[PDB]
Design an enzyme around this catalytic site. Structure first.
Site, mmCIF file in Angstrom:
data_model
loop_
_atom_site.group_PDB
_atom_site.id
_atom_site.type_symbol
_atom_site.label_atom_id
_atom_site.label_comp_id
_atom_site.label_asym_id
_atom_site.label_seq_id
_atom_site.Cartn_x
_atom_site.Cartn_y
_atom_site.Cartn_z
ATOM 1 N N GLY A 131 -2.300 -6.526 4.427
ATOM 2 C CA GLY A 131 -0.910 -6.961 4.177
ATOM 3 C C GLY A 131 -0.431 -7.931 5.245
ATOM 4 N N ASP A 136 11.978 -10.332 -0.149
ATOM 5 C CA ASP A 136 10.663 -10.650 -0.766
ATOM 6 C C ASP A 136 10.410 -9.705 -1.949
ATOM 7 O OD1 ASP A 136 8.286 -12.181 -1.015
ATOM 8 O OD2 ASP A 136 7.209 -10.953 0.467
ATOM 9 N N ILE A 180 -7.510 0.197 2.182
ATOM 10 C CA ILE A 180 -7.200 -0.456 0.866
ATOM 11 C C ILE A 180 -6.713 -1.902 1.054
ATOM 12 C CG2 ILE A 180 -6.880 1.669 -0.440
ATOM 13 C CD1 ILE A 180 -3.791 1.142 -0.158
ATOM 14 N N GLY A 181 -6.146 -2.260 2.213
ATOM 15 C CA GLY A 181 -5.728 -3.647 2.513
ATOM 16 C C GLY A 181 -5.179 -3.804 3.920
ATOM 17 N N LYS A 188 0.207 2.748 7.109
ATOM 18 C CA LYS A 188 0.212 1.360 7.649
ATOM 19 C C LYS A 188 0.072 1.465 9.169
ATOM 20 C CE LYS A 188 2.861 -2.023 5.990
ATOM 21 N NZ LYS A 188 3.883 -3.075 5.766
ATOM 22 N N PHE A 228 1.541 -7.205 7.937
ATOM 23 C CA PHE A 228 1.496 -6.514 9.255
ATOM 24 C C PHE A 228 0.524 -5.331 9.172
ATOM 25 C CE2 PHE A 228 3.812 -2.773 11.313
ATOM 26 C CZ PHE A 228 3.288 -2.919 12.576
HETATM 27 C C1 LIG Z 1 1.949 2.526 4.040
HETATM 28 C C2 LIG Z 1 3.167 1.623 3.981
HETATM 29 C C3 LIG Z 1 4.111 1.736 4.990
HETATM 30 C C4 LIG Z 1 5.247 0.943 4.994
HETATM 31 C C5 LIG Z 1 5.462 0.007 3.993
HETATM 32 N N1 LIG Z 1 6.661 -0.718 4.105
HETATM 33 C C6 LIG Z 1 7.574 -0.841 3.093
HETATM 34 O O1 LIG Z 1 7.367 -0.366 1.989
HETATM 35 N N2 LIG Z 1 8.742 -1.507 3.272
HETATM 36 C C7 LIG Z 1 9.199 -2.123 4.523
HETATM 37 C C8 LIG Z 1 10.621 -2.671 4.318
HETATM 38 C C9 LIG Z 1 11.113 -1.900 3.064
HETATM 39 C C10 LIG Z 1 12.113 -2.799 2.340
HETATM 40 C C11 LIG Z 1 12.827 -2.078 1.198
HETATM 41 F F1 LIG Z 1 13.529 -3.055 0.480
HETATM 42 F F2 LIG Z 1 11.900 -1.423 0.377
HETATM 43 F F3 LIG Z 1 13.736 -1.139 1.697
HETATM 44 C C12 LIG Z 1 9.802 -1.666 2.257
HETATM 45 C C13 LIG Z 1 4.525 -0.120 2.968
HETATM 46 C C14 LIG Z 1 3.378 0.687 2.959
HETATM 47 C C15 LIG Z 1 2.401 0.523 1.867
HETATM 48 C C16 LIG Z 1 1.573 -0.610 1.817
HETATM 49 C C17 LIG Z 1 0.663 -0.714 0.756
HETATM 50 N N3 LIG Z 1 -0.176 -1.828 0.621
HETATM 51 C C18 LIG Z 1 -1.294 -1.816 -0.347
HETATM 52 C C19 LIG Z 1 -2.251 -2.977 -0.022
HETATM 53 C C20 LIG Z 1 -0.808 -1.838 -1.827
HETATM 54 O O2 LIG Z 1 -1.312 -0.709 -2.565
HETATM 55 N N4 LIG Z 1 0.606 0.258 -0.156
HETATM 56 C C21 LIG Z 1 1.349 1.355 -0.149
HETATM 57 N N5 LIG Z 1 1.134 2.239 -1.211
HETATM 58 C C22 LIG Z 1 -0.264 2.589 -1.514
HETATM 59 C C23 LIG Z 1 -0.325 3.033 -2.981
HETATM 60 O O3 LIG Z 1 0.523 4.177 -3.150
HETATM 61 C C24 LIG Z 1 1.899 3.958 -2.789
HETATM 62 C C25 LIG Z 1 2.042 3.384 -1.369
HETATM 63 C C26 LIG Z 1 2.289 1.516 0.877
#
Ligand SMILES: Cc1ccc(NC(=O)N2CC[C@@H](CC(F)(F)F)C2)cc1-c1cc(N[C@H](C)CO)nc(N2CCOCC2)c1
Ligand SMILES: [Cl-]
Ligand SMILES: [Cl-]
Ligand SMILES: [Cl-]
Length: 269
Positions: free
Chosen positions: A18, A126, A15-16, A35, A20
């Site tokens: 990002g 952020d 889906i992307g 991720k 990292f």
């Molecule tokens: C897979 C994954 C693992 C880790 C993280 N990392 C974090 O969230 N964070 C790191 C620090 C912490 C700071 C705090 F302030 F939140 F604590 C937040 C993000 C993701 C991720 C990344 C993405 N990108 C896509 C492109 C956006 O649709 N989409 C999801 N979602 C997909 C749709 O359905 C829900 C999920 C999930």
């Protein structure tokens, strides 16, 4: 222990990418998000260790649910899967017209999430409508997830590469070595309140990124609060101004902010 053993996680559609790694939809006891970094350098390993290290400290309904990580065979973080879009998508791309009660509800839930992170001594660094997800277009999920967003051209040779509309003045000028604080996150939330109540990004009249960076930095720019909807409460317009105060210490903390929103929530027809 949250380490997911190898062969369990079934990786699906990408889906992307990002900031990292690469993010895929997955299957692990139902739908998930994965991720993944494919290779690992000491800086990659340190990013992973820190990202897991933050997520493992969060059990809250308005924070994205971390479910586990993978050390072998490759580095991966597994979170819940959410049907819906980012707040940015709703407000600015497809331009959803939410009712005022739901805009306040979204603001209340974002405040609940940020309050929790600050209680855990976690600075987001952020926050922005891009990083607020609406699960079934209902429930706010704060995370760290962009798509030619206003300033499409690459900022490779610029100083500030990321999103500047949500950055507080002290974060832009970078006079301190670390200008990020709880109040820096409050300012960012202040801009999210502006997006909800106007349905627009701030500084729409201006089309030069560098000029916005300069002017917000030297305190010549703050958002035009007259652009809010007519049925927006005066209490919200007052709270918005307090959140977006140019001086750092004059900005409130989320305990007071969340209190102010839950008060004006009860009294609206
Ligand atoms: C897979 C994954 C693992 C880790 C993280 N990392 C974090 O969230 N964070 C790191 C620090 C912490 C700071 C705090 F302030 F939140 F604590 C937040 C993000 C993701 C991720 C990344 C993405 N990108 C896509 C492109 C956006 O649709 N989409 C999801 N979602 C997909 C749709 O359905 C829900 C999920 C999930
Ligand atoms: Cl846990
Ligand atoms: Cl563009
Ligand atoms: Cl503006």
């Amino acid at each position: 222990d949250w380490e997911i053993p190898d062969g369990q996680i079934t990786v699906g559609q990408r889906i992307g990418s990002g900031s990292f790694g690469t993010v895929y939809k997955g299957k692990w006891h139902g739908d998930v998000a994965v991720k993944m970094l494919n290779v690992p350098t000491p800086q990659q390993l340190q990013a992973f260790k820190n990202e897991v290290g933050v997520l493992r400290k969060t059990r809250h309904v308005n924070i994205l649910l971390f479910m586990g990580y993978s050390t072998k065979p490759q580095l991966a973080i597994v979170t819940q899967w959410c049907e819906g879009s980012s707040l940015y998508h709703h407000l600015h791309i497809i331009e959803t017209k939410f009712e005022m009660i739901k805009l306040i509800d979204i603001a209340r839930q974002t405040a609940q999430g940020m309050d929790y992170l600050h209680a855990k001594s976690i600075i987001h660094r952020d926050l922005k409508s891009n990083n607020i997800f609406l699960h079934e277009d209902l429930t706010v999920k704060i995370g760290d997830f962009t798509v030619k967003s206003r300033w499409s051209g690459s900022h490779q040779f610029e100083q500030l590469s990321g999103s500047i509309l949500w950055m507080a003045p002290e974060v832009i000028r970078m006079q301190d070595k670390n200008p990020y604080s709880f109040q820096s996150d409050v300012y960012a939330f202040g801009i999210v309140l502006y997006e909800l109540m106007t349905g627009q990004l701030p500084y729409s009249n201006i089309n030069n990124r560098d000029q916005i960076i300069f002017m917000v930095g030297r305190g010549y720019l703050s958002p035009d609060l007259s652009k809010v909807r007519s049925n927006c409460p005066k209490a919200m317009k007052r709270l918005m101004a307090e959140c977006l105060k140019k001086k750092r210490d004059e900005r409130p903390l989320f305990p007071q902010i969340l209190a102010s929103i839950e008060l004006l929530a009860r009294s609206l027809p």
